[PDB]
DNA sequence: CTGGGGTCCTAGGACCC
DNA sequence: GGGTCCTAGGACCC
């Protein structure tokens, strides 16, 4: 049919929760990210900091080259987690059809709700307001007939605002929309479809689908469907965690197995505790390890295995350390585990 | 000067048709 | 010629 979707997105989420519990940071540049001593990167940044040009996923070295007086915080999870619990409860009051994406996001299908006389625009306005009133944080909304447009619109108005796209607005909206804003079209593909001349949807709309399944396979279909603004994906509230990882990047590389083993001794207890919260008996499907060398190439060894076992990890890492390092430094060691199927 | 937590997609070989 | 599991890797998102 024609549904009503509401992408809610907390505005620079982890930064906002810091500014509220510490109003001193309200107007001075702040970021959450690992310190440059540790080779970290920026998670999020307040608006005083984005002035300078600091964005998420930026190396901390560069965040300070463009904003020296940047206050760097490590980050507090629950403070973000507890806040993200509340917003989800607030969604619960309006629908049960809630697809949580990350901590600050949520797709909401409201097609079958009469909370605000069946107007998605108010329901969105309500959640944004009632989140503000009880958590003292601001949120932003995107209303659309489908999932990906509701998300694009949530960044449309950006800070403490919303943006609505009706089916009559859609065909014009997609003429000028660049492929890179379509969630799932990141840097590499954006660069590639453009080597073929395709920068906006409207360029793809005049293209052939037979060939787009040649050059891109399945991804060419998804591209083609939304360059057409078709998106059948349903708001699923049932998705579960499939895997639990713990990984670490160290200040200066390591070159000897004894060091790598010393790291594994310390990340295993965290992986145990984390997996305990979900499987108190530790039964799993596969476990494995992950190295990242200095040439940034990354390798994985993982094999079917019944229960989180410390000694098999050290074993498997050691074997990977031997036959795949080629005597390069390694900047990252990590442990992984794939959950059982239920 | 490049995190840490994840998701989904691809592809070859193995296994069992 | 199948499906499906197993494994490794890559693009992508917050
Ligand atoms: N690469 C990344 C990107 C995001 N994050 C995490 O994602 C959160 C919100 O996502 P987000 O993408 O919405 C950013 P937000 O802070 O909310 O800015 P906005 O107001 O424009 O939406 C941040 O608070 C970070 O912890 C990360 O850890 N690594
Ligand atoms: Mn956000
Ligand atoms: Mn978000």
Residue A237 lies in a domain: no
- For chain A, the domain total comes to 4
**Which atom of ligand 1 approaches the CA of A104 most closely?**
9
A83: domain CATH number is: 3.30.70.270
CB A306 within 8 A of CB A283: yes
Those residues whose C-beta lies under 8 Å from the C-beta of residue A213, and which sit 6 or more positions away, are A220, A221
Residue A235 lies in a domain: no
Q: Residue A204 burial by CB count (10 A; 0-12/13-18/19+): exposed, middle or buried?
A: buried
Q: How far is it, in rounded angstroms, from Cα A97 to Cα A62?
A: 41
Residue A134 lies in a domain: yes
Determine the structural domain holding residue A6 and report its residue range: 1-21+75-175
Q: Could you tell which of A8, A11, A43 is best to mutate to test the pocket of ligand 1, judged by most ligand atoms within 8 Å of the CB?
A: A43
Residues of A marked active site are found at 105
Domain shared by A220 and A184, yes or no: yes
Q: How many CB atoms lie within 10 A of CB A256?
A: 9
Closest-lying nucleotide for A219 based on CA to C1': B9
Q: How far is it, in rounded angstroms, from Cα A49 to Cα A100?
A: 28
* DSSP at A230: -
Three-state DSSP state, A302: strand
Domain shared by A132 and A226, yes or no: no
Domain shared by A122 and A3, yes or no: yes
A215: domain CATH number is: 1.10.150.20
Domain shared by A168 and A183, yes or no: no
CB A314 within 8 A of CB A264: yes
């Amino acid at each position: 049919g024609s549904r009503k979707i509401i992408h809610v997105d907390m505005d620079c989420f982890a930064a906002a929760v810091e500014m509220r519990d510490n109003p001193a940071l309200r107007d001075i540049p702040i970021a959450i990210g690992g310190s440059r001593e540790r080779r970290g990167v920026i998670s999020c940044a307040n608006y005083p900091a984005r002035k300078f040009g600091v964005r998420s996923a930026m190396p901390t070295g560069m965040a300070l080259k463009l904003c020296p007086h940047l206050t760097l915080l490590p980050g507090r999870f629950d403070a973000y987690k507890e806040a993200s619990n509340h917003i989800r409860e607030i969604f619960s009051r309006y629908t049960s059809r809630i697809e949580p994406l990350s901590l600050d996001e949520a797709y909401l299908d409201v097609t079958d709700s009469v909370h605000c006389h069946g107007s998605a625009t108010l329901i969105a306005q309500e959640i944004r307001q009632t989140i503000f009133n009880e958590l003292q944080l601001t949120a932003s909304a995107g209303v659309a007939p489908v999932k990906f447009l509701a998300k694009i619109a949530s960044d449309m108005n950006k800070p403490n605002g919303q943006f609505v796209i009706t089916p009559a607005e859609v065909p014009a909206f997609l003429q000028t929309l660049p492929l890179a804003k379509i969630p799932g079209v990141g840097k590499v593909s954006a660069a590639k479809l453009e080597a073929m001349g395709l920068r906006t949807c409207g360029d793809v709309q005049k293209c052939d689908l037979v060939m787009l399944l040649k050059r891109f396979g399945k991804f060419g279909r998804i591209l083609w469907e939304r360059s057409q603004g078709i998106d059948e994906r349903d708001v699923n509230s049932e998705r579960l965690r499939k895997s639990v990882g713990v990984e670490r990047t160290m200040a200066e590389d390591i070159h000897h197995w004894s060091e790598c083993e010393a790291i594994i001794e310390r990340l295993y207890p965290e992986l145990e505790r984390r997996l305990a919260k979900v499987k108190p008996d530790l039964l799993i499907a596969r476990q494995g390890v992950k190295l990242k060398f200095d040439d940034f190439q990354q390798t994985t060894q993982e094999h079917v295995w019944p229960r989180l076992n410390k000694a098999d990890l050290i074993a498997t890492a050691r074997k990977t350390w031997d036959e795949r390092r080629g005597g390069r430094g390694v900047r990252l060691v990590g442990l992984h585990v794939t959950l059982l199927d239920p």
